[PDB]
Design a protein around this ligand. Sequence first.
Ligand code: CL
Ligand code: NA
Length: 129
Amino acid sequence: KVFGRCELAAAMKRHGLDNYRGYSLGNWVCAAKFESNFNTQATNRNTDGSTDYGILQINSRWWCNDGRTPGSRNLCNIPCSALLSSDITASVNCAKKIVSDGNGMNAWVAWRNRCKGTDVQAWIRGCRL
Ligand SMILES: [Cl-]
Ligand code: NA
């Protein structure tokens, strides 16, 4: 599924991400825009054998099991295919686990490069949340 910007903001709101571990809602919407262009089916296959899955491009080396990633752990306790659903719940529940892992949202390369430092409230303009 592809989300619209405000549609995704609403969905993330309802999953309690606003101010989750100190990160306002705009952060998460911005992250999703630049990681996956709002696409729940996005995949990116890397040179280390890992794959980034779903709307927040969660990586298979640490966080999910896809059966084909070298030296893999499964800290979200889920198959990676669960992150490819039109339902963002699994992605949100695993993202919560990741942002609490000590380096906040710098776990997302697109956030740290494209969102960090900017006025992220703009991502929820016009949404009427
Ligand atoms: Cl695996
Ligand atoms: Na894994």
